[PDB]
Amino acid sequence: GAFRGKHLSFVVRFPNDDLEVWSHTNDTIGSVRRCILNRIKANVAHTKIELFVGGELIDPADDRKLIGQLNLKDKSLITAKLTQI
Secondary structure (H helix, E strand, O other): XOOOOOOOOEEEEEOOOOOOOOOOOOOHHHHHHEEEEHHHHHHOOHHHHHHHHEEEOOOOHHHHOOOHHHOOOOOOEEEEEEEEE
């Protein structure tokens, strides 16, 4: 359909831990750098996105529903959270 499609954009906001590294006096500096980078990479590989509109969590079960069905218009705010595991 009844309604003409419209393009619209959203501003996604992300409102928001030390890491213990085990090393050795004879290990290289690079081994620690690479250990830290590999952990950051591992963390992102285990990351999912949670989405909130008007306070309420949007269940991934609803992901084939349309943006037009949400309480969103042009330039509306979406709140996202990065969640590990």
